[PDB]
Design a protein around this ligand. Structure first.
Ligand SMILES: [Cl-]
Ligand SMILES: [Cl-]
Ligand SMILES: [Cl-]
Ligand SMILES: [Cl-]
Ligand SMILES: [Mg+2]
Ligand SMILES: [Mg+2]
Ligand SMILES: [Mg+2]
Ligand SMILES: [Mg+2]
Lengths: 397, 397
């Protein structure tokens, strides 16, 4: 069966963000009882105001659709209109910017778990233009976790290992080896996520997933950074900006493989981007869209493909984010229309016959690297109709 | 027996900092094998260059002196001179700024544990002018930890609870209930630190200190902030600056009790301060010393005393940091000579007949508050002569 993941399927939709409303840096989850909301933010390109509406899909732990019917999981109707929008101001590339907060006055959630918001043009309800995915937690267990570059297979070389315990004194679970499903995500990436974990030990009030070989991740590197807050000067990692009607074009400085080196402390935001422009008080309507040109100078890597990776492509490894190789210049190259701001990014290699991207070949794997890991604990005892999300935590090093 | 703690005992010494050399935000520990150094930084007031020298004291887990002799714990001599110094430039208040990195070319450490650096004027070796304290870890165990406002005694009200496991597959310990000594510190404070912990459970490769009543701390509040980067404008929380020979005087805005309210997200640095001044490229020699005036307007609190708290007084609760009460103005008030920069601070109440400060009465206790907790794991099997520090970690929420 089919999996729901945050992805854009329309060329007219850009800069899809899923974050906690009001937060600069966040994770795509909120508490069921809580005061926080998820914010889905995106632009539609063109001058047209367009009527978009959404459906709520309840999913199980693995992001396949659950068997629940809407009345079981939401209060409110499917096909609600997205009313909160505004036109671009003072930009070459025209667009409208849209914002949906959830839960809201029209839709509230009745159960925990994974949710997928599918958006469409009201005229064309069967063509989904994007899916935005977030989770809703009922936090009845506490998770104590650590990340170390000292792992079971090496010692401060190229890996990081996650270790955690589920503390459940106040939510006893008789058979957690069967009734829990755990997902662990590095830097909000699904491609190299881990699941099918077994506890190393189970006490009455503590379930330990420590020393688990599957919880060893390659360490990667700090993401590459780039900024283009105006067309007047060259921002960070920008070689030149030029205008070719109708767009400004940002030539980024040339990138090189970083795997053959020594770790360099850089401060990143683990693949995130931030929409910003010089002297803009509302970048969501004032930031323009420029063609950004990425260049990775190396010989082509055999037996796989290179993908541009980060929140800028929703961490999706597909034909949109895959990079072609220019054999005239001996470079991987890609042009991407992006809204002005600060971007993290990196280059992942996917070996042929795999769906898992690797930081090793181009970015390198350095145990010191600051990464984040989100641990999602889903609960499903025999006879329950759906996967509850009973704990979640994000740990850094 | 007597305990060593970071403290200044001379009126001519100011702005003692203990941090990891090169780090903006740090903890006062380094790894025994590692590439990092502790930096001890301080000013001596006056124009005089003065010859200061230091001794290294090895301490046990509780910061009493161990039975080790210098040859057992250090390579190098006692009474080494502090050579790295520079005079103030362009400041009303004259001083020299001193910097000692450890380990260095003259002193290296042979064992892990707690170290106290006692500094003195070479002329007067029996009068210690300050002690600077840091720890050296041989990290042979990993600590997985969490902090939650959902505790065993309440639920997202006024407390935080720390939960942790010591993962020791690669450093087996037969009787950890006897051979481990654990200290847990909130926001680098010794006054309300916790120890004498018993494991709730001991497996062959995991020791759990979860659900421990002593590991529940009051949550406190984000520290108050203030900045005075020049005498020209009034910085954050500054009401006015004025000159009364020989010093500039900073009148801080009036502070009030914050316990009767709702949590306000503020970004703090958990009691730290940062030496900075406008257009200064070397604040350590360019930042001036002004008299800063603190005011807390409330009725006097009975059955205890109020102390100004933070890195600015090395988190020491004594006669230096205690606040007098002005019954004319109905305010707690204190004048402190401080080097220009950004300061975190707060006001703690110490009940009479106690040495433990409370955030509750003046700052309030809010479960949301971002705090840090450092967990130090010391190891001493029967017959060992000293407490090794075999693991340490700092966790936030
Ligand atoms: Cl699982
Ligand atoms: Cl292209
Ligand atoms: Cl103990
Ligand atoms: Cl005073
Ligand atoms: Mg076992
Ligand atoms: Mg990073
Ligand atoms: Mg038990
Ligand atoms: Mg804080």
């Amino acid at each position: 069966q089919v999996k729901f993941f945050t992805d854009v399927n329309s060329k007219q939709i850009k800069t899809l963000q899923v974050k906690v409303a009001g937060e600069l840096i966040s994770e795509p989850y909120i508490a069921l009882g809580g005061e926080e909301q998820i914010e889905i933010n995106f632009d539609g390109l063109g001058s047209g105001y367009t009527r978009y509406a959404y459906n709520v899909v309840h999913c199980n732990a693995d992001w396949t659709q659950s068997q629940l019917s809407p009345i079981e999981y939401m209060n409110g109707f499917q096909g609600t209109t997205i009313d909160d929008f505004a036109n671009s101001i003072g930009t070459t590339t025209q667009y409208s910017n849209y914002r949906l907060l959830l839960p809201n006055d029209d839709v509230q959630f009745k159960v925990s778990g994974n949710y997928a918001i599918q958006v469409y043009n009201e005229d064309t309800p069967d063509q989904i233009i994007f899916t935005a995915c977030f989770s809703v937690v009922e936090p009845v267990v506490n998770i104590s976790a650590s990340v170390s570059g000292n792992t079971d297979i090496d010692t401060n070389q190229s890996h990081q290992q996650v270790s955690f315990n589920i503390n459940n004194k106040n939510f006893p679970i008789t058979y957690p080896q069967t009734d829990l499903k755990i997902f662990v995500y590095q830097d909000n990436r699904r491609d190299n996520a881990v699941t099918d974990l077994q506890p190393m030990s189970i006490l009455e009030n503590q379930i330990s997933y420590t020393y688990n070989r599957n919880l060893i991740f390659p360490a990667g590197n700090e993401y590459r950074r780039m900024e283009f807050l105006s067309n007047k000067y060259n921002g960070m990692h920008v070689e030149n900006i030029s205008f070719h009607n109708p767009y400004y074009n940002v030539e980024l400085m040339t990138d090189y493989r970083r795997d053959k080196g020594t770790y360099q402390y850089d401060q990143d935001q683990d693949g995130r981007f931030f929409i910003r422009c010089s002297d803009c008080n509302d970048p969501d309507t004032e930031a323009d869209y420029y063609i950004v040109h990425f260049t990775l100078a190396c010989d082509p890597l055999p037996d796989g493909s290179v993908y541009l990776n980060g929140e800028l492509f929703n961490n999706v490894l597909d034909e949109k984010s895959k990079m072609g190789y220019n054999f005239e210049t001996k470079q991987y190259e890609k042009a991407v229309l992006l809204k002005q701001g600060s971007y993290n990014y990196q280059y992942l290699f996917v070996p042929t016959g795999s769906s898992v991207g690797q930081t090793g070949p181009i970015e390198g794997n350095y145990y010191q690297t600051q990464n984040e890991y989100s641990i999602y604990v889903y609960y499903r005892p025999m006879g329950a109709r759906y996967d509850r999300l009973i704990g979640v935590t994000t740990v850094r090093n």
